[PDB]
Design a binder for this molecule. Structure first.
Ligand SMILES: *[C@@H]1O[C@H](CO)[C@@H](O)[C@H](O)[C@H]1NC(C)=O
Lengths: 48, 49
């Protein structure tokens, strides 16, 4: 109740912090993935 | 317009599907075997067992 601790010297420290910001932008196509080059499959896909 | 299914298009950029190229030719390649195996012997044999 009557003792304190006071520092007499100091130091300068540099720390690194890495943060993600963005990711890859991906675009898909329903054609040439679901049916490919096939007119018969593409005809049935028009309802979706 | 066919990709976005609309007649009026807003200003911007859009990815488009394939509606441009269509095949117009046929290429058939079979092996050149000319011998005719007998359906007159395995079917119309003398006596089935
Ligand atoms: C099978 O062959 C015999 C003679 O070769 C002929 O008389 C008979 O009509 C033939 N069977 C059929 C179903 O054509």
């Amino acid at each position: 109740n009557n003792s304190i601790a006071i520092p007499t010297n100091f130091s300068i420290s540099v720390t690194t912090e890495v943060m993600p910001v963005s990711m890859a932008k991906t675009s898909v196509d329903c054609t040439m993935y679901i049916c490919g080059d096939s007119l018969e499959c593409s005809n049935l896909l028009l309802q979706y | 317009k066919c990709t976005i299914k609309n007649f009026n298009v807003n200003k911007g950029i859009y990815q488009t599907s394939n509606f441009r190229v269509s095949p117009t030719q046929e290429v058939v390649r079979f092996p050149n075997i000319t011998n005719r195996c007998p359906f007159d012997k395995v079917f119309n044999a003398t006596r089935f067992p």
